[PDB]
Design an enzyme around this catalytic site. Structure first.
Site, PDB file in Angstrom:
ATOM      1  N   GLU A 190      82.875  53.828 124.464  1.00  0.00           N
ATOM      2  CA  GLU A 190      83.648  53.417 125.640  1.00  0.00           C
ATOM      3  C   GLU A 190      83.929  51.910 125.557  1.00  0.00           C
ATOM      4  OE1 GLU A 190      82.728  55.564 129.489  1.00  0.00           O
ATOM      5  OE2 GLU A 190      82.754  53.504 130.272  1.00  0.00           O
TER       6      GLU A 190
ATOM      7  N   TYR B 119      64.381  35.808 104.720  1.00  0.00           N
ATOM      8  CA  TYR B 119      65.107  37.031 105.048  1.00  0.00           C
ATOM      9  C   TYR B 119      64.380  37.813 106.147  1.00  0.00           C
ATOM     10  CZ  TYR B 119      68.445  36.615 101.146  1.00  0.00           C
ATOM     11  OH  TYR B 119      69.438  36.187 100.291  1.00  0.00           O
TER      12      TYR B 119
ATOM     13  N   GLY C 170      72.883  48.406  99.542  1.00  0.00           N
ATOM     14  CA  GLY C 170      72.493  47.164  98.889  1.00  0.00           C
ATOM     15  C   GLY C 170      71.285  46.503  99.515  1.00  0.00           C
ATOM     16  N   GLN C 171      70.822  45.396  98.932  1.00  0.00           N
ATOM     17  CA  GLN C 171      69.649  44.698  99.431  1.00  0.00           C
ATOM     18  C   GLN C 171      69.749  44.315 100.900  1.00  0.00           C
ATOM     19  OE1 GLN C 171      67.722  41.554  97.001  1.00  0.00           O
ATOM     20  NE2 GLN C 171      67.787  40.392  98.949  1.00  0.00           N
TER      21      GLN C 171
ATOM     22  N   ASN D 135      75.203  34.840 108.250  1.00  0.00           N
ATOM     23  CA  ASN D 135      73.851  34.404 107.926  1.00  0.00           C
ATOM     24  C   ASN D 135      73.615  32.941 108.320  1.00  0.00           C
ATOM     25  OD1 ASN D 135      72.929  36.298 104.903  1.00  0.00           O
ATOM     26  ND2 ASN D 135      72.178  36.526 106.971  1.00  0.00           N
TER      27      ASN D 135
HETATM   28  N1  LIG Z   1      70.454  38.556 106.449  1.00  0.00           N
HETATM   29  C1  LIG Z   1      70.208  38.972 105.206  1.00  0.00           C
HETATM   30  N2  LIG Z   1      71.061  38.675 104.230  1.00  0.00           N
HETATM   31  C2  LIG Z   1      70.686  39.188 103.039  1.00  0.00           C
HETATM   32  C3  LIG Z   1      69.566  39.930 102.745  1.00  0.00           C
HETATM   33  N3  LIG Z   1      69.524  40.231 101.392  1.00  0.00           N
HETATM   34  C4  LIG Z   1      70.607  39.674 100.901  1.00  0.00           C
HETATM   35  N4  LIG Z   1      71.355  39.027 101.851  1.00  0.00           N
HETATM   36  C5  LIG Z   1      72.653  38.362 101.688  1.00  0.00           C
HETATM   37  O1  LIG Z   1      73.549  39.287 101.099  1.00  0.00           O
HETATM   38  C6  LIG Z   1      74.296  38.654 100.038  1.00  0.00           C
HETATM   39  C7  LIG Z   1      73.917  39.264  98.708  1.00  0.00           C
HETATM   40  O2  LIG Z   1      74.068  40.697  98.750  1.00  0.00           O
HETATM   41  P1  LIG Z   1      72.839  41.629  98.325  1.00  0.00           P
HETATM   42  O3  LIG Z   1      72.640  42.593  99.431  1.00  0.00           O
HETATM   43  O4  LIG Z   1      71.713  40.782  97.867  1.00  0.00           O
HETATM   44  O5  LIG Z   1      73.420  42.413  97.057  1.00  0.00           O
HETATM   45  P2  LIG Z   1      73.464  43.957  96.645  1.00  0.00           P
HETATM   46  O6  LIG Z   1      74.290  44.713  97.613  1.00  0.00           O
HETATM   47  O7  LIG Z   1      72.077  44.400  96.362  1.00  0.00           O
HETATM   48  O8  LIG Z   1      74.258  43.872  95.261  1.00  0.00           O
HETATM   49  P3  LIG Z   1      73.911  43.645  93.703  1.00  0.00           P
HETATM   50  O9  LIG Z   1      72.521  43.042  93.730  1.00  0.00           O
HETATM   51  O10 LIG Z   1      74.937  42.721  93.089  1.00  0.00           O
HETATM   52  O11 LIG Z   1      73.933  45.040  93.111  1.00  0.00           O
HETATM   53  C8  LIG Z   1      74.030  37.160 100.199  1.00  0.00           C
HETATM   54  O12 LIG Z   1      74.984  36.568 101.078  1.00  0.00           O
HETATM   55  C9  LIG Z   1      72.611  37.141 100.773  1.00  0.00           C
HETATM   56  O13 LIG Z   1      72.297  35.949 101.486  1.00  0.00           O
HETATM   57  C10 LIG Z   1      68.667  40.247 103.807  1.00  0.00           C
HETATM   58  O14 LIG Z   1      67.638  40.910 103.736  1.00  0.00           O
HETATM   59  N5  LIG Z   1      69.075  39.713 105.015  1.00  0.00           N
HETATM   60 MG   LIG Z   2      70.417  44.183  94.976  1.00  0.00          MG
END
Ligand SMILES: Nc1nc2c(ncn2[C@@H]2O[C@H](COP(=O)(O)OP(=O)(O)OP(=O)(O)O)[C@@H](O)[C@H]2O)c(=O)[nH]1
Ligand SMILES: [Mg+2]
Ligand SMILES: Nc1ncnc2c1ncn2[C@@H]1O[C@H](COP(=O)(O)OP(=O)(O)CP(=O)(O)O)[C@@H](O)[C@H]1O
Ligand SMILES: Nc1ncnc2c1ncn2[C@@H]1O[C@H](COP(=O)(O)OP(=O)(O)CP(=O)(O)O)[C@@H](O)[C@H]1O
Ligand SMILES: Nc1nc2c(ncn2[C@@H]2O[C@H](COP(=O)(O)OP(=O)(O)O)[C@@H](O)[C@H]2O)c(=O)[nH]1
Ligand SMILES: [Mg+2]
Ligand SMILES: [Mg+2]
Lengths: 346, 425, 430, 317
Positions: free
Chosen positions: C245, C215, C10-11, C197
């Site tokens: 360990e 981010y 995921g993102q 976060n």
């Molecule tokens: N620290 C941090 N949090 C992130 C980042 N990108 C998204 N988030 C957090 O992750 C959550 C959202 O999940 P994402 O990773 O955006 O979603 P995904 O897994 O791509 O899922 P879908 O878009 O629904 O397919 C939220 O709580 C965001 O604040 C990043 O680059 N860094």
């Molecule tokens: Mg995404």
């Protein structure tokens, strides 16, 4: 076959300790600056602590604890009482003191406390002393502060004990000196015998310029008191004569009325600085003889006045005290009822 | 009279490598295996620990075992690394993760048969095998789990031989993992049943010695191993040099072990040296007083808290035998309460002319009832975790059952109550 | 020879993965093209060709985010097959990520992972990076973990989970996705490091003086903490202690596998002052709540483990003295069934910072991993938000519409209730 | 605006506090689990402190200090006195106590102290609480025949007895610690007195206020309540709350805390005050409810959420 060095010829206590180590086979006195020693009877100032214990073959022990000055200096003791977590809220046995600097100053806080007692009609006599010489007793903050500014040294304004316990006959002021030996394992030992540095002039609450009744300093009494040695030899009363006066005149023993408070104060003071001076994590071991100075008020309450890092003993007690230092602190590290071990209840 | 040496795990191989470097020096053997000594009194019983190879080379009868190559690669590169027989290095790739169950049941079971093939080969080439000596720790996984597995398999194949171990006990002061009391308790249970003699080398004692006595504030494993290798040298002197007392593993066991389960010894050494220490040569009276002092014990037990069933003292170097006997008799007369009266003449003394190193030293081996303090410390730590089943998943995950833990805990508690029974006799 | 495959889902997992690999490259002197002039311990994370290629897989159900990796500075670093993308994302819906869309891409992912496993002479396990809140991060990750437990039975699986924070939250249903993914993944994860976060956000605002952190700001700080945790696997030394360990000490019970990470020092690159920072100063900072990766009060939680991972100019003497001072001065209370001791590890390799970054370069740093019952506060906050919405069945239709049932919701919530109770029991004295 | 929640209906003190907030017109009471509150009048056990101060923009304050039970539970108070650096060597006001576990465990230390007292002919009466006896064998058996952790405290055999009646009594003081940790001692205290004469053998056995107690002290001992008892009380409160201050301070926490404490003291015949127990959720005396609850509203609530001389602020020297 142990070796020792003597780096302080002015120390009367360790001069006798040196003689006790000799004339008993086991000890040989090495030259000063010779680094292959077992015991070091070091100097009062600038002791080379960094060079100690760095020979991986011999066991080195020194007659001083590095960092003891944070308890034995007048200003650092005031700082310790007011800032240590173990003492700041629990200390009821140290007279109200403030560090003053002339031309970390607590000058503003002193004036607030002086004005608070003044408005309430409370006792306002204070004593100023440098870190017996340069001591002013006065009930005027203006007079006290000006005295500090004249001398180029840090002074401490302590609350003067206006109502001390006065010895009879004579109606005279006195202070108690207790000898405490802390060994390599930080076991605190109070020497059974103490000394009362008494004044030979009757005490009065009005004239503060009369230093013979207000200051119990031994040098002040020999140099200015016309009755010096009138009641006891060299103005020094021992615990047998003091316990007899207490049990007779006041119907109370020295052990319960004063010594319990003394033992409590000693243990609290040495244990507050224990983590900062402990030689557990150091290549060498330390031991030190301390001189605790107390003052008893008329309600039989003991007050800590000063702690001495390099104290001097009373002539008759030198033999027993110096033998105790040899047995408890030296012979425990280097092996061939006069010292109470001070411990916590639990 | 040959001894087959086995070293298992990180600790076992580290202390084992030092033991071989130390004795190789004492016997005039260089890293290439060639003899270049200034006495032959070095080759008289050299066959007890070394085999004789083709070009007059002496090869240690040692087997190096581990489930990870790391420590054994360090050995192969160290000073005496080339002395060992290359075929006698038996190691796996997936370690033991400080887990007794992995060393005893899973990872170790896969490697054990190949180790036994080397043990068997070394045994078949023995004129008269006395037994085996294993170096290992009880807090890890390979030395602890696989080591006790090896002991069990060896005993099955050689039930009529002596099984001796140098077992390093774990301590929180010098710890690698929180599961050490589990590993140690499980191993002690094995030791109580399958060893004839175990030298209890306590890491707590080795630490306190380095810290309090030597004033080595912040000691390393190298510092602890300095004491170990020196003690191991002392306790094996009677087997490596011509002597009359405890000259073999069986006579040592007969003299030191009055009750089959009570075979855990408290070693002692004097003088306590520090790697690269200074000048004097300790008089016989000084050697004797120190080796009997709690501060010189390699097990964190106060001998004044129990009684000695048997004791074996060994003095090394040129000294007065009359003075040794006077000093040895004096320690007993001055502390006769700490030696059981129902075992007459339970303190034996040996003297070896060849010193370690040093001009003169003394090694102590005591079967004291105070050793229960070591087993109590472990039992306390083990119970604190087992009571709440903490960290058990790592063990049960390997096939083990909770019942096995309850039995090991119980057997060690029985061992403590047995040591106490003889202390009250 | 123990390799470690990283999986970024995921993102959040991808963007955090980009930051970690950027840092690892700087730490190991690896250029964006894979070349390493200095040329092993770093081979746990990198395979060799003279190109050093990360043993990583990037997965996302949508191509924008990974497409930035494909065209960015580190495009050459990865092999194309390691970057896997779908067409339609999970729309912040756990059910779409785990079921509807997850089923469509799962087999391809497992194959790309198998290709990395086949290049390992002794695979130690996986490190899975993902968010709790996203549909892919929550849904697809739990499906992946379920399949990995089947295809790789024994192998260890560690997590870096991004805990939701309203300051940067993109979905109202993040509490739902968090409980659902935690429940499904619980049996399949051996150790999980939660990254709140909100905690990283507040550290950036306070310690780095950043008014509104992005981010990129968050991820660079996260990468430093992740780097400290994985340093023991990428470097080796006499004082270096392996992460597995520490993991033996960190996880007393299979379900209680969530260590709290605390890091120090976090100093602004412009407001550095030139102060050095003693071993004693940074060690003390590990016990300041302001430096934790998860918002909680460890003072009111019992410790089950405490590990100190030092990184630069650090000698044991200083560490022991700092620990001694911290004891008899701090609210460090252990459970009565655990030894009250600290497991220490030191890596002489000093910390690295990204050039032109917000973090100042320091001479020494420390990351503390502690298993404290205080982390259960994070579950309580999440479970409460889940309870508020689930009481009214708000948004549930989005999940049911993708084939899920209300039963999975209550089953996942009941498991979370049991987890909160497990943290309560483990703190009670015996 | 200001909103508040009430999660403890059994608390008589905060029931009156709730009424006072509602009387102002500035406060609205929300449902029990509404998380968008400003003030929380939480429950005695298992208060959700982790959920506090996390809703963005909201200023949240709770009527309890997380921890503080380390000073309130009998065993933890004994542990704190004996182990805190601020108290271990300086504490002369807490009776000799040992934590005894029935099923860590200072049983061996209690027997050593009991044997020291019977050998020297000293007073050996002890009180076990979760039985008053001078035997220790029947005291230990009492603990083991219960599934609770008890504390063996030294029984004060020579208490200050009220005349007429020659009766035992204990003092209860109310202390309010607001956010920013300012300790306030409520001017009025209560004496939970006994209505039977004191016996030094019979082990088988009413609210006086500070004005009546001050009047008994002169004429009875010619001394005032202060300088003999009130200074000791103030010193003990200051030492106790400041030993736990670093472990319970909310300065580095997203929410603020405040708590009303109930300090229980016992005065011996030498006029020495001894701390017996601290109460986290105390109950007030009927006539002092209005003044105490108004003081909680003004000092602790109105300081954080803004719309006399009855609370002495305790400070050192
Ligand atoms: N620290 C941090 N949090 C992130 C980042 N990108 C998204 N988030 C957090 O992750 C959550 C959202 O999940 P994402 O990773 O955006 O979603 P995904 O897994 O791509 O899922 P879908 O878009 O629904 O397919 C939220 O709580 C965001 O604040 C990043 O680059 N860094
Ligand atoms: Mg995404
Ligand atoms: N607060 C106080 N109240 C009453 N008397 C005090 C006092 N402080 C000091 N004194 C008196 O003054 C004397 C000297 O006190 P001080 O603390 O200065 O002595 P000291 O032995 O540390 C060395 P110095 O020679 O520098 O004064 C004490 O012995 C005592 O008689
Ligand atoms: N050491 C002691 N000496 C005299 N009376 C005592 C005492 N300990 C308790 N009491 C009396 O017994 C009562 C018991 O009260 P409770 O059971 O609520 O706890 P407590 O205040 O006694 C607690 P602790 O265990 O700290 O002593 C007290 O209110 C007091 O009157
Ligand atoms: N004295 C000593 N103890 C060690 C050494 N290495 C590890 N230990 C101890 O042995 C235990 C760990 O076992 P180890 O031998 O490392 O692991 P294994 O590979 O599973 O046998 C712990 O109790 C350590 O304190 C060493 O070289 N010397
Ligand atoms: Mg081993
Ligand atoms: Mg082992």
């Amino acid at each position: 076959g142990y070796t020792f060095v003597v780096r302080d010829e002015n120390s009367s206590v360790y001069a006798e300790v040196s003689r006790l180590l000799l004339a008993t086979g086991h000890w040989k006195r090495l030259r000063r600056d010779n680094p292959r020693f077992n015991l070091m009877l070091g100097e009062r100032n600038r002791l080379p602590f960094g060079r100690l214990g760095h020979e991986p073959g011999l066991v080195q022990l020194v007659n001083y604890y590095r960092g003891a000055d944070k308890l034995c200096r007048k200003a650092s003791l005031v700082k310790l009482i007011k800032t240590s977590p173990e003492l700041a809220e629990s200390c009821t046995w140290f007279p109200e003191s403030y560090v003053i600097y002339p031309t970390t100053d607590e000058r503003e806080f002193f004036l607030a406390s002086y004005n608070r007692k003044k408005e309430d009609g409370e006792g306002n006599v204070w004593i100023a002393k440098s870190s017996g010489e340069g001591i002013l007793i006065s009930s005027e903050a203006s007079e006290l502060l000006d005295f500090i500014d004249n001398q180029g040294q840090v002074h401490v304004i302590q609350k003067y004990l206006e109502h001390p316990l006065l010895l009879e006959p004579g109606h005279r002021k006195f202070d108690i000196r207790s000898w405490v030996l802390v060994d390599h394992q930080y076991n605190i030992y109070l020497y059974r015998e103490g000394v009362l540095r008494t004044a030979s002039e009757p005490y009065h609450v009005d004239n503060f310029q009369d230093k013979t009744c207000h200051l119990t300093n031994h040098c002040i009494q020999k140099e200015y008191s016309k009755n010096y040695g009138k009641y006891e030899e060299g103005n020094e009363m021992f615990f047998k004569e003091f316990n007899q006066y207490l049990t007779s005149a006041l119907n109370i023993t020295l052990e319960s009325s004063i010594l319990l408070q003394i033992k409590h104060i000693i243990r609290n003071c040495l244990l507050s600085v224990e983590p900062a001076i402990s030689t557990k994590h150091l290549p060498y071991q330390s031991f030190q003889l301390f001189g605790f100075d107390f003052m008893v008020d008329e309600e039989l309450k003991v007050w800590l006045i000063e702690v001495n890092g390099a104290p001097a003993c009373a002539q008759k007690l030198y033999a027993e005290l110096c033998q105790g230092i040899v047995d408890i602190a030296i012979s425990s590290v280097f092996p061939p009822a006069a010292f109470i071990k001070l411990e916590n209840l639990y | 009279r040959e001894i087959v040496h086995i070293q298992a795990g990180q600790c076992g191989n580290q202390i084992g490598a030092k033991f071989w470097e130390v004795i190789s020096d004492e016997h005039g053997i260089d890293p290439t295996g060639s003899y270049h000594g200034d006495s032959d009194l070095q080759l008289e019983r050299i066959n007890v620990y070394y085999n004789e190879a083709t070009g007059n080379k002496y090869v240690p009868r040692a087997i190096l075992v581990d489930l990870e190559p790391g420590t054994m690669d360090s050995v192969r590169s160290g000073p005496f690394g080339q002395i060992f027989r290359p075929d006698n290095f038996v190691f796996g790739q997936s370690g033991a993760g400080n887990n007794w169950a992995k060393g005893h049941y899973t990872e170790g079971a896969e490697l054990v048969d190949s180790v036994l093939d080397v043990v068997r080969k070394e045994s078949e080439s023995c004129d008269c095998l006395q037994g085996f000596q294993l170096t290992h720790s009880l807090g890890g996984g390979t030395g602890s789990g696989m080591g006790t597995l090896l002991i069990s398999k060896i005993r099955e194949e050689y039930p009529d031989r002596i099984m001796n171990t140098f077992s390093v006990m774990p301590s929180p002061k010098v710890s690698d993992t929180v599961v050490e009391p589990y590993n140690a308790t499980l191993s002690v249970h094995q030791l109580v049943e399958n060893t004839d003699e175990t030298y209890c080398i306590d890491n707590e004692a080795l630490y306190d010695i380095c810290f309090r006595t030597l004033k080595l504030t912040t000691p390393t494993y190298g510092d602890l191993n300095h004491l170990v290798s020196a003690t191991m040298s002392g306790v094996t002197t009677c087997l490596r040099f011509p002597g009359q007392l405890n000259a073999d593993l069986r006579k040592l066991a007969v003299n030191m072990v009055p009750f089959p389960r009570l075979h855990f010894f408290m070693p002692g050494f004097a003088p306590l040296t520090s790697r690269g220490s200074q000048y004097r040569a300790l008089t016989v009276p000084e050697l004797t007083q120190q080796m009997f002092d709690s501060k010189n014990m390699m097990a964190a037990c106060d001998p004044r808290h129990g009684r000695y069933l048997t004791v074996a003292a060994i003095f090394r170097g040129r000294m007065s035998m009359k003075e040794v006997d006077e000093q040895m008799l004096n320690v007993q007369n001055k502390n006769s309460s700490y030696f059981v009266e129902w075992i007459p003449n339970n303190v034996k003394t040996a003297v070896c002319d060849i010193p370690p190193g040093l001009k003169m030293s003394a090694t102590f081996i005591g079967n004291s009832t105070a050793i229960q303090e070591l087993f109590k410390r472990i039992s306390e730590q083990f119970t604190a975790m087992f009571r709440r089943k903490a960290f058990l998943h790592w063990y049960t995950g390997e096939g083990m059952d909770e019942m096995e833990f309850t039995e090991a805990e119980s057997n060690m508690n029985d061992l403590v109550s047995e040591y106490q029974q003889y202390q009250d006799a | 020879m123990r390799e470690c495959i990283s999986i970024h889902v995921g993102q959040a997992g991808v963007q955090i993965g980009n930051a970690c690999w950027e840092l690892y490259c700087l730490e190991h002197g690896i250029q964006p093209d894979g070349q390493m002039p200095s040329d092993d311990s770093f081979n746990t994370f990198f395979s060799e060709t003279g190109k050093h290629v990360p043993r990583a897989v990037f997965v996302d159900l949508e191509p924008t985010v990974i497409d930035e990796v494909r065209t960015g500075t580190y495009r050459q670093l990865f092999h194309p097959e390691q970057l896997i993308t779908g067409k339609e994302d999970a729309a912040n819906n756990y059910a779409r990520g785990h079921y509807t869309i997850g089923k469509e891409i799962i087999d391809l992912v497992l194959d790309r992972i198998r290709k990395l496993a086949d290049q390992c002479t002794g695979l130690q396990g996986f490190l899975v990076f993902h968010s709790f809140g996203g549909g892919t991060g929550s849904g697809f990750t739990s499906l992946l973990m379920e399949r990995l437990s089947v295809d790789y039975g024994k192998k260890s699986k560690l997590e870096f989970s991004i805990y939701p924070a309203p300051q940067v939250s993109t979905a109202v249903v993040e509490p739902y996705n968090s409980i659902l993914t935690t429940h499904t993944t619980l049996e399949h994860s051996d150790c999980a490091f939660m990254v709140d976060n909100e905690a990283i956000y507040d550290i950036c605002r306070r310690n780095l003086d950043i008014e509104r952190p992005t981010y990129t700001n968050l991820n660079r700080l996260i990468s430093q903490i992740v780097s400290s945790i994985t340093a023991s696997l990428r470097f080796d030394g006499a004082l270096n202690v392996d992460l597995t360990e520490f993991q033996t000490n960190l996880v007393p019970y299979p379900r209680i596998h969530f260590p709290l990470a605390t890091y120090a020092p976090v100093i602004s690159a412009e407001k550095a002052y030139h102060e050095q920072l003693s071993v004693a100063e940074i060690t003390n900072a590990c016990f300041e709540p302001a430096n934790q990766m998860v918002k909680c009060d460890p003072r009111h939680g019992k410790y089950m483990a405490c590990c100190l991972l030092y990184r630069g100019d650090v000698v044991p003497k200083d560490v022991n003295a700092a620990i001694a001072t911290i004891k008899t001065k701090r609210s460090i209370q252990f459970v009565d069934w655990c030894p009250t001791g600290f497991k220490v590890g030191i890596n002489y390799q000093p910390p690295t910072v990204v050039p032109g970054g917000d973090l100042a370069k320091v001479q020494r740093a420390v990351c503390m991993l502690s298993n404290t019952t205080a982390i259960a506060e994070a579950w309580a906050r999440l479970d409460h938000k889940f309870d508020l919405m689930y009481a009214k069945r708000a948004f549930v239709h989005w999940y049911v519409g993708e084939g899920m049932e209300e039963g999975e919701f209550s089953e996942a919530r009941e498991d979370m209730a049991a987890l909160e109770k497990d943290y309560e029991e483990v703190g009670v004295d015996s």
